[PDB]
């Protein structure tokens, strides 16, 4: 499941977490089994304007 969020909001990607994107955009089950991936992508997903 791929998506792009802010740098500080990656801590919300966990079972039973509170947050803004956690409760309105993407919510994980409490019995979630697996792994999560994160890496900085500022060089590609950002512009001067």
């Amino acid at each position: 499941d791929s998506f792009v969020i802010r740098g500080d909001e990656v801590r919300q990607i966990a079972p039973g977490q509170t947050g803004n994107i956690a409760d309105y955009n993407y919510k994980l089950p409490d019995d979630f089994t697996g792994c999560v991936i994160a890496w900085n992508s500022n060089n590609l997903d950002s512009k001067v304007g």
Partner: protein, 50 residues
């Protein structure tokens, strides 16, 4: 105030809607220990010190 002389502000005789705190995105960290953040609007307290 300074951390060595931290101010203690009592909160009493008021109705508190914690939604305006929860819906605020300016907070870098939002963490509760003994209570659920989304259940705060359903509980009655006193002895509230900020």
């Amino acid at each position: 105030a300074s951390v060595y002389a931290w101010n203690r502000k009592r909160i009493s005789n008021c109705v508190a809607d914690y939604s305006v705190l929860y819906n605020s995105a300016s907070f870098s960290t939002f963490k509760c220990y003994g209570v659920s953040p989304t259940k705060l609007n359903d509980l009655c307290f006193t002895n509230v010190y900020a």
